Structure formats: C-alpha cells, structure tokens
Symmetry: none
Subunit: 73 residues, 6 copies
C-alpha cells in the first residue's frame, strides 16, 4: 500500500480599509431600578444588574484561515 | 493500492473598503423598572437586568476561509 | 505500507488599515438602583451590580491562522 | 437413628461498581404552614411537622446473604 | 441416636467500588410555620417540629452475612 | 445419645472502595417559627423544635457478619 498525502496551498485571505473609526457603543444609558421585597430563595441564585459583558471589537483586519488536515488508516 | 491525494488551492478571499465608520450602537437607552414582591423560588435562579452581552463588531475586513481535508482508509 | 504525509502551505493572511481610531465605548451611563427588603437565601448567591466585564478591543490587525495536522494509524 | 446434616456452600454474592455518585436528595423544599385554632384533644397526641426521618443510604455494595439452618428432632 | 450437625461454609459476600461520593442530602430547606391558639390537651403530647432524625448513611461496603444455626432435641 | 455440633466456616465478608468522600448533609436550612397562645396541657409534654438527632454515618467499610448458634437439648 502507498498513500501519498500532498495537498498544496497558495491561498491568500486579505483586506484593505482606507480608514476605520468614528465608532460609538453606549449600552445602559437608561436608569435601572430593581425593588425586591419578601423574596425567598431555597436553591442557588445568580444575579447580574446594570451594564455587563458588553464588547466593542474593532480589528483593523479580523481575517481568519481555519485549516484541518486529517489522515486515518 | 496507490492513493495519491494532491488537491491544489490558489484561491483568494479579498475585500476593499474606502472607509468604514460613523457606526452608532445604543442598547438600553430606555429605563428599566423591576418590582418583585413575595416571590418564592424552590430551585435555581439566573437573573439578568439592564444592558448585557451587547456586541459592536466592526472588522476592517472580516473574511473567512474554512478548509477541511480528510482521508480515511 | 508507505504513508507519505507532505502537506505544503504558501498561504498569507493579511490586512492594511490606513488609520484606526476614534472608538468610544461608554457602558453604564445610567444610574443603577437596587433596593432589597426581607430577602431570604438558603443556598449559594452570586451577585454582580454596576459595570463589569465590558471589553474594548482594537487590534491594528487581529488576523488568525488556525492549522491542525493529524495522522492516526 | 442416624441423622447427617451436611449442607455445603461455596456460593459468592458479589458486585463491582465503576463509580457511584452524583446523588441529590432534597426533601421538604416546599414550606409547611400549620394553623390550629380552638382544637380539643381528650387523649394522646403525636405530631410530626417539617422534614423528619428522611434517609439517604448509598452503600458501595449492598449485598445480603441470609442463611438459616434448622434441625428439629 | 446419632445427630451429626456439620454444615460447611465457604461463602463470600463481596464488593469492589471504583469511587463513592458527590452525595447531597438537604432536608427541610422550606420554612415551617406552626401557629397554635386556644388548644386544649387532656392527655400526653409528643411534638416534633423542624428537621429531625434525618439520616445520611454512605458505607464503602454495606455487605451483610446473617447466619442462624439451630438444633432442637 | 451423641449430638455432634461442628458447623465449619471459612467465609469472608469484604469490600474495597477506591475513594470515599464528598458527602454533604444540611438538614433544617429553612427557618422554624412556632407561636403558641392560650394552650392548656393537663399531662406530660415532650417538644423537640429545630434540628435534632440528624445522623451522618460514612464508614470506610460498614460490613456485618451476624452468626447465631443455638443447641437446645
């Protein structure tokens, strides 16, 4: 048995941007009011209140090559 | 048996943008009011209140190449 | 048995951005008011209140190559 | 009279367990509210209220051999 | 008369357990409220209120041999 | 008369546990409120209130051999 596994790649993944900017992200500008009375928790509680986990992501290029080569005999 | 596995790939994935910008994202500009009375929880609670997990994502190029090569004998 | 595993890569993953900036991220500009009376917790509590885990991420290039080679006999 | 009582016993009672666990028992997570007004007992009273006599029993092996030998002459 | 009582035993009662754990027992997580007004008792009262007599029993082996030999003459 | 009473035992009652642990027992996590007004008892009263007589029992091996021999002549 001969197996020859010779995949060849000359690919390009490219971008050109003349400028990138003037980007505004303002989560949670409105007031948040939470009022709790006489509550009863008999098991686990997770509480998030306000402005959490918000992302601004502005990469000058966010290009991806994802590449898997697999041989199973 | 001979198996010759010789795929060749000269592809290009490309973008050009003259400029990118003036982008405005404003989640949760409105007020949030939560009033809770006499509630009773016999099991687990997850609570999110306000402005959470909002994404602004402005890649100057967001190009993707996804590529899988598989041989099973 | 011969297995010859000779994958060849000449790839490029690239970006050019002429300028990158004027990026604004303002989570939680609104007031957060949390008022609790007579609450009763009989198991674990996690509480986050205010402005937490917000990300600004502005890489001059955030390009990725991900490349996996596997041979199983 | 000759009586020979010679039962012979090479038996095995056996278990193998790869792992045992992740067992949750939560009796009485609901509230109990008892309101008694103007009751009249002319004899003995036994009252159990709440969470009583609850068993969790998790033996790593819970085998029984029960063996009775009786001779009546 | 000859009576020869000679039961011969080579029994085994056995377990092998790879691990035993992650056992949770939470009786009476709910509240108990007992309100008694104007009650009359002519005879004996036993009252149990709350979380009583609850058992967690986790033996790494719980094997029993129970073995009774009786001769009546 | 001859009575020979020669029961013979080579038995074993056995366990092997690779690890034992991570056992949690929390009786009476809920509050107990008892309010008694204008009650009248003409005989003995036993009252248990709160968290009483609760057992945790975790023996590394909790095997039993019970072996009873009786000859009645």
């Amino acid at each position: 048995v001969q197996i020859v596994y010779k995949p060849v790649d000359l690919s390009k993944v490219t971008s050109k941007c003349g400028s990138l900017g003037n980007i505004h992200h303002k989560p949670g500008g409105g007031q948040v009011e939470v009022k709790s009375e006489k509550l009863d928790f008999k098991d686990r509680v997770q509480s998030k209140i306000g402005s959490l986990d918000n992302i601004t992501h502005v990469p000058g290029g966010g290009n991806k090559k994802i590449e898997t080569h697999k041989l199973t005999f």
